[PDB]
Design an enzyme around this catalytic site. Structure first.
Site, PDB file in Angstrom:
ATOM      1  N   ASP A  15      11.745 -46.966 -45.397  1.00  0.00           N
ATOM      2  CA  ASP A  15      12.883 -47.765 -44.951  1.00  0.00           C
ATOM      3  C   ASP A  15      13.208 -47.645 -43.480  1.00  0.00           C
ATOM      4  OD1 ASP A  15      14.242 -45.371 -44.774  1.00  0.00           O
ATOM      5  OD2 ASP A  15      15.371 -45.664 -46.633  1.00  0.00           O
ATOM      6  N   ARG A  29      16.397 -49.081 -39.104  1.00  0.00           N
ATOM      7  CA  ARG A  29      16.666 -48.674 -40.468  1.00  0.00           C
ATOM      8  C   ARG A  29      16.994 -49.921 -41.259  1.00  0.00           C
ATOM      9  NH1 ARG A  29      17.837 -47.612 -45.165  1.00  0.00           N
ATOM     10  NH2 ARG A  29      18.501 -45.564 -45.995  1.00  0.00           N
ATOM     11  N   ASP A  34      17.661 -47.810 -49.917  1.00  0.00           N
ATOM     12  CA  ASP A  34      17.279 -46.414 -49.740  1.00  0.00           C
ATOM     13  C   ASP A  34      15.955 -46.182 -50.433  1.00  0.00           C
ATOM     14  OD1 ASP A  34      17.768 -43.732 -48.808  1.00  0.00           O
ATOM     15  OD2 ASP A  34      18.133 -43.212 -50.938  1.00  0.00           O
ATOM     16  N   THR A  35      14.941 -45.839 -49.650  1.00  0.00           N
ATOM     17  CA  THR A  35      13.680 -45.390 -50.258  1.00  0.00           C
ATOM     18  C   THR A  35      13.668 -43.873 -50.364  1.00  0.00           C
ATOM     19  OG1 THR A  35      12.700 -45.486 -48.029  1.00  0.00           O
ATOM     20  CG2 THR A  35      12.268 -47.391 -49.525  1.00  0.00           C
ATOM     21  N   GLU A  37      12.378 -40.071 -49.641  1.00  0.00           N
ATOM     22  CA  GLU A  37      11.733 -39.475 -48.495  1.00  0.00           C
ATOM     23  C   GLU A  37      10.262 -39.267 -48.828  1.00  0.00           C
ATOM     24  OE1 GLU A  37      15.096 -37.616 -45.914  1.00  0.00           O
ATOM     25  OE2 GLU A  37      13.219 -38.701 -45.563  1.00  0.00           O
ATOM     26  N   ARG A  75      19.965 -45.741 -34.537  1.00  0.00           N
ATOM     27  CA  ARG A  75      18.974 -46.592 -35.171  1.00  0.00           C
ATOM     28  C   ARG A  75      19.504 -48.001 -35.265  1.00  0.00           C
ATOM     29  NH1 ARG A  75      17.548 -43.340 -40.585  1.00  0.00           N
ATOM     30  NH2 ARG A  75      19.754 -43.965 -40.847  1.00  0.00           N
TER      31      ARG A  75
HETATM   32  C1  LIG Z   1      21.412 -47.809 -44.055  1.00  0.00           C
HETATM   33  C2  LIG Z   1      22.495 -47.146 -43.248  1.00  0.00           C
HETATM   34  C3  LIG Z   1      22.511 -45.800 -43.086  1.00  0.00           C
HETATM   35  N1  LIG Z   1      23.509 -45.234 -42.324  1.00  0.00           N
HETATM   36  C4  LIG Z   1      23.603 -43.772 -42.252  1.00  0.00           C
HETATM   37  C5  LIG Z   1      24.314 -43.184 -43.508  1.00  0.00           C
HETATM   38  C6  LIG Z   1      23.719 -41.774 -43.647  1.00  0.00           C
HETATM   39  O1  LIG Z   1      24.449 -40.992 -42.670  1.00  0.00           O
HETATM   40  P1  LIG Z   1      24.608 -39.424 -43.017  1.00  0.00           P
HETATM   41  O2  LIG Z   1      23.173 -38.877 -42.620  1.00  0.00           O
HETATM   42  O3  LIG Z   1      25.588 -38.907 -42.033  1.00  0.00           O
HETATM   43  O4  LIG Z   1      24.893 -39.096 -44.523  1.00  0.00           O
HETATM   44  C7  LIG Z   1      22.274 -42.066 -43.124  1.00  0.00           C
HETATM   45  C8  LIG Z   1      21.258 -42.342 -44.230  1.00  0.00           C
HETATM   46  O5  LIG Z   1      20.000 -42.569 -43.542  1.00  0.00           O
HETATM   47  P2  LIG Z   1      18.645 -42.267 -44.262  1.00  0.00           P
HETATM   48  O6  LIG Z   1      18.579 -42.691 -45.663  1.00  0.00           O
HETATM   49  O7  LIG Z   1      17.620 -42.957 -43.313  1.00  0.00           O
HETATM   50  O8  LIG Z   1      18.329 -40.686 -44.235  1.00  0.00           O
HETATM   51  O9  LIG Z   1      22.323 -43.184 -42.218  1.00  0.00           O
HETATM   52  C9  LIG Z   1      24.455 -45.987 -41.732  1.00  0.00           C
HETATM   53  O10 LIG Z   1      25.411 -45.453 -41.096  1.00  0.00           O
HETATM   54  N2  LIG Z   1      24.491 -47.333 -41.906  1.00  0.00           N
HETATM   55  C10 LIG Z   1      23.514 -47.934 -42.664  1.00  0.00           C
HETATM   56  O11 LIG Z   1      23.558 -49.154 -42.788  1.00  0.00           O
HETATM   57 CA   LIG Z   2      15.779 -42.885 -47.162  1.00  0.00          CA
END
Ligand SMILES: Cc1cn([C@H]2C[C@H](OP(=O)(O)O)[C@@H](COP(=O)(O)O)O2)c(=O)[nH]c1=O
Ligand SMILES: [Ca+2]
Length: 129
Positions: A15, A29, A34-35, A37, A75
């Site tokens: 993702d 992103r 959510d994929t 890891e 991102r």
């Molecule tokens: C998809 C997405 C993730 N995020 C944030 C939420 C999570 O933050 P926290 O890390 O603080 O919990 C993280 C999840 O990313 P990943 O699934 O890439 O690890 O990215 C956003 O803020 N907005 C979004 O649209």
């Molecule tokens: Ca992920």
């Protein structure tokens, strides 16, 4: 929303992809999904699916939603299309991503992705197996 050109540097995992955005290398992103890891179950499969879909395409495009365009990690947040087919939707439809991280005002394709997720669940695909 509207599509616009994107320049793939490389896929990263299920993702996230690396793109050249106005001459800056930037991680994007995928919105609404959510994929797993890479070293979790279906991780390598989700990575490979996104990687082949974006690398093998003639064209990548991205589509911002109406809210945040960057997350707290710098991102970019977008829907990504490979030859007109949305990667975010395709991952969910194949049970390689869950619908996730749904925030108000960046949720235009929510119902489309929930329809895909229900079909993946009904078919007990991958994550839902
Ligand atoms: C998809 C997405 C993730 N995020 C944030 C939420 C999570 O933050 P926290 O890390 O603080 O919990 C993280 C999840 O990313 P990943 O699934 O890439 O690890 O990215 C956003 O803020 N907005 C979004 O649209
Ligand atoms: Ca992920």
């Amino acid at each position: 929303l509207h599509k616009e050109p994107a320049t793939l540097i490389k896929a990263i995992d299920g993702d996230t992809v690396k793109a050249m955005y106005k001459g800056q290398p930037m991680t994007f992103r995928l919105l609404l999904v959510d994929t797993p890891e890479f070293n979790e179950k279906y991780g390598p499969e989700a990575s490979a699916f996104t990687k082949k879909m974006v690398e093998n395409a003639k064209k990548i495009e991205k589509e911002f939603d109406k809210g945040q365009r960057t997350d707290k990690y710098g991102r970019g947040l977008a829907y990504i299309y490979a030859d007109g087919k949305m990667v975010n939707e395709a991952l969910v439809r194949q049970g390689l991503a869950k619908v996730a991280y749904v925030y108000k005002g960046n949720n235009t394709h929510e119902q489309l992705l929930r329809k895909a997720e229900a079909q993946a669940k009904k078919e007990k695909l991958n994550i839902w197996s």
